[PDB]
Scaffold this active site. Structure first.
Site, mmCIF file in Angstrom:
data_model
loop_
_atom_site.group_PDB
_atom_site.id
_atom_site.type_symbol
_atom_site.label_atom_id
_atom_site.label_comp_id
_atom_site.label_asym_id
_atom_site.label_seq_id
_atom_site.Cartn_x
_atom_site.Cartn_y
_atom_site.Cartn_z
ATOM 1 N N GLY B 96 -10.351 -40.638 46.589
ATOM 2 C CA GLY B 96 -11.627 -41.156 46.122
ATOM 3 C C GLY B 96 -12.755 -40.534 46.916
ATOM 4 N N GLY B 98 -13.551 -37.549 47.216
ATOM 5 C CA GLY B 98 -14.114 -36.340 46.638
ATOM 6 C C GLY B 98 -13.526 -35.077 47.264
ATOM 7 N N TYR B 134 -10.870 -30.703 35.301
ATOM 8 C CA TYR B 134 -11.263 -29.308 35.108
ATOM 9 C C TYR B 134 -12.312 -29.128 34.016
ATOM 10 C CZ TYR B 134 -7.327 -27.964 38.074
ATOM 11 O OH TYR B 134 -6.453 -27.757 39.127
ATOM 12 N N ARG B 136 -14.591 -31.262 33.108
ATOM 13 C CA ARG B 136 -15.902 -31.740 33.588
ATOM 14 C C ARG B 136 -16.584 -30.638 34.382
ATOM 15 N NH1 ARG B 136 -12.909 -36.424 34.551
ATOM 16 N NH2 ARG B 136 -12.596 -35.957 36.765
ATOM 17 N N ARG B 137 -15.792 -29.657 34.822
ATOM 18 C CA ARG B 137 -16.320 -28.558 35.601
ATOM 19 C C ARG B 137 -16.536 -27.279 34.816
ATOM 20 N NH1 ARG B 137 -14.473 -32.172 38.513
ATOM 21 N NH2 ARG B 137 -15.092 -32.429 40.716
ATOM 22 N N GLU B 146 -7.447 -18.828 22.697
ATOM 23 C CA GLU B 146 -6.945 -17.493 22.418
ATOM 24 C C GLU B 146 -5.470 -17.410 22.019
ATOM 25 O OE1 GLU B 146 -10.123 -15.784 25.763
ATOM 26 O OE2 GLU B 146 -8.012 -15.166 25.861
#
EC number: 2.3.1.57
Lengths: 162, 164
Positions: B96, B98, B134, B136-137, B146
């Site tokens: 939590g 971070g 991932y 969210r980034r 692809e």
């Protein structure tokens, strides 16, 4: 035609780029290939197929095929040989170039003690899929449920200055 | 906490976390990495980052390393050098603060200096917490976009081709 398989050298960068573009935005330049492949820490390795003059391309070139690869690592598989691209010019297929390149890549894997050779194939390219399955390949993504992701530069920049 | 390059003294903890993550991915039994291998290949066939905490934060049994990321560099014939994230894990009791976010920031800095234009990695189909982390980034699903499928040819088959 008569051909030989050999490691690419710094002098082959223009041909590697020519072949990449033929295999194909390619924004990679010859300068990148030289800096990235022939410094103290090369980021890729290349095996090329060279033919003598009686068989040079119409453009007068001697390199007609290549395999670009590098070594990778997976904690639950082993050291791995990763095959990034493999291409033989259309007019030079059927003489054994691809089979010799795959043979040498395999010997290289045995030298490095790699547990497996990994590579990507497009899901819709049945011909390629079956070519590799005939050689023992398995679709790891589908069998084990793995998806490939990427995070592009604009995002990496934001996180790197944050 | 602090994110820093790993060192031989970390080899023990890295192996422990590798096995924790393996269990989460349903394959602890397939782990063949040994603290000795990590020493002979880590100092290299891969680079490791570790999240280290101070002593008032050390785990109950005394571990100072509570997370790691293992990466190496790959190549794309269209755009060049890429950074490949092989494994990424943070101990449950430490999720939590971070820490995962910081590991990604460290990896992004590695990418920026080494002039990597993209960072690639695999995610399990059902791993929603990782997919969302991932996405969210800015991450995008390449298997989707692809059509890529990861194929493998194991040793026994490479031997057949090598000796043909």
């Amino acid at each position: 035609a008569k051909f030989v398989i050999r490691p690419a050298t710094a002098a082959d960068c223009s041909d590697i780029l020519r072949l990449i573009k033929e295999l194909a935005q390619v924004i990679l330049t010859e300068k990148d290939l030289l800096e990235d492949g022939f410094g103290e820490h090369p980021f890729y390795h290349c095996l090329v197929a060279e033919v003598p003059k009686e068989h040079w391309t119409p453009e007068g070139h001697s390199i007609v095929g290549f395999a670009m690869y590098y070594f990778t690592y997976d904690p639950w598989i082993g050291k791995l040989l990763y095959l990034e691209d493999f291409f033989v010019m259309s007019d030079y297929r059927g003489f054994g170039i691809g089979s010799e390149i795959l043979k040498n890549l395999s010997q290289v894997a045995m030298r490095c003690r790699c547990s497996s050779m990994h590579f990507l194939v497009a899901e819709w390219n049945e011909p390629s899929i079956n070519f590799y399955k005939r050689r023992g390949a398995s679709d790891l993504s589908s069998e084990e449920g793995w998806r490939l992701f990427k995070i592009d530069k604009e995002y990496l920049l934001k996180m790197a200055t944050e």
